């Protein structure tokens, strides 16, 4: 089993150094390096580097001058540093476990077949060597295996990822307003409640209901962006108490907002 979790600031200023931390845990960590992969908004996945059990770090050649990857085994953490960041470095950053291995591979030389897979046509000399070839000029010739290195790579496990925005602009924490249907609304046995997370920047925010205990019937929507430069999103529940938990990491703000259906009482 594997557990990978990224931590670090969601907002970094240009020319500063982006620093992230991955807390890794699990028996499936062994035999694997811990790597960092990022994906900018419209771009493909981009490899940053990794550090292996041997304690050595390898990097994407295009980013080696700006990237540094270390590990703290006393904390079971692996760190990522990106110096002199620009808006090009705004991305979602993934902590990963990585398989990397150079493997010696034996194959028959050009034009030769394997003496193990010739069925009933194997020449008698196959008993002395690995491969064989035939030409009507010189008949059967023989040869040993050629040796080549095969470089194996694949990401095994992925973390949830963490969004980092490179910008010189400041933050704005959101206001949380309750969402409840009008009193003059045509009624049903289903109640729709929600939370309006209003006028924040930058992304992201997360929403849970009743500290995660309530999940079925919960639908959280991606944010809209206004002319002011501020984001807004809403989360609704369809069905007790109802508290929406809003977190805005860039401003270090968490908000708990209890939501009630409209009393329609005169109260």
């Amino acid at each position: 089993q594997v557990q990978l979790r990224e931590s670090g600031p969601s907002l970094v200023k240009p020319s500063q150094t982006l620093s992230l931390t991955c807390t890794a845990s699990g028996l499936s960590l062994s035999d694997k390096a811990v790597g960092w992969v990022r994906q900018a908004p419209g771009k493909a996945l981009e490899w940053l580097g990794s550090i292996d059990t041997g304690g050595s770090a390898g990097y994407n050649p295009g980013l080696k001058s700006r990237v540094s990857i270390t590990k703290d085994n006393s904390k079971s953490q692996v760190s990522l540093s990106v110096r002199g960041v620009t808006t090009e470095d705004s991305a979602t950053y993934y902590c990963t476990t990585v398989h990397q291995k150079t493997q010696l591979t034996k194959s028959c030389p050009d034009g030769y077949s394997d003496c193990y897979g010739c069925g009933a046509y194997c020449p008698y000399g196959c008993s002395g060597d690995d491969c064989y070839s035939y030409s009507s000029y010189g008949g059967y010739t023989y040869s040993s295996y050629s040796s080549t290195y095969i470089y194996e790579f694949f990401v095994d496990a992925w973390g949830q990822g963490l969004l980092v925005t490179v910008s010189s602009a400041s933050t704005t924490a959101p206001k949380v307003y309750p969402l409840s249907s009008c009193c003059g609304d045509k009624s049903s046995s289903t109640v729709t409640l929600g939370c309006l997370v209003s006028s924040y920047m930058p992304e992201p925010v997360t929403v849970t209901w009743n500290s995660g205990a309530l999940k079925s019937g919960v639908h959280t929507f991606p944010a809209v962006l206004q002319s002011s430069g501020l984001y807004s999103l809403s989360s609704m529940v369809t069905v007790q108490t109802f508290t929406c938990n809003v977190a805005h990491p860039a401003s270090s703000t968490k908000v708990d907002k209890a939501v009630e259906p409209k009393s329609c009482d005169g109260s």
Binding site: Y94, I150, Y151, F153, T192
Partner: protein, 215 residues
Amino acid sequence: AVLNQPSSVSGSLGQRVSITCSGSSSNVGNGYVSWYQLIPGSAPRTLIYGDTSRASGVPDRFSGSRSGNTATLTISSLQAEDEADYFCASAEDSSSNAVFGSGTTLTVLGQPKSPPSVTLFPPSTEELNGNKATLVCLISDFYPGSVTVVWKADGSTITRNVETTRASKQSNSKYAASSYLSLTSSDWKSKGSYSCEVTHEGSTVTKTVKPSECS
């Protein structure tokens, strides 16, 4: 530096599709190629490693193969949840120097039409205390993923201070969106009714709130 994939590919529900990854002798020609699936708003999932080996928990409908400097991912018996971005990857020269493919967006054709579900929320008493009113239209469960939104008050169409999201992928591989009408407190109370009209594949779904009866 890049492994060339087609930008987008489409396939029919219940049929097969193939995504290609073409490179050179240094990467794909090396003979160890991996594939990954990325559903938006979800952690990437490894599907294939070493050309043909399927990662744990990946069904046999997914299949990897390679011929020279071009690897292909093949998905059979396509389902709605296979809609995602697919990336190939390979090592080049070094085993700690990875190159990723440019990515391919997969669309699964032939799924049933689904009308949108609409909920219209009025502004809260707390917000109106600040002399501002945000009407919130929440739109969920529509395929294909494209809707046009229209706001009306007392029969007249409103274009001012309307901001609508693009459709985004839900957990059930359907689409969701939202629209916001920003008003002053006096604008909110000055009309008999507001409406959010969501049109999808030529059909319109409407919800309506009445300020004076909202309490």
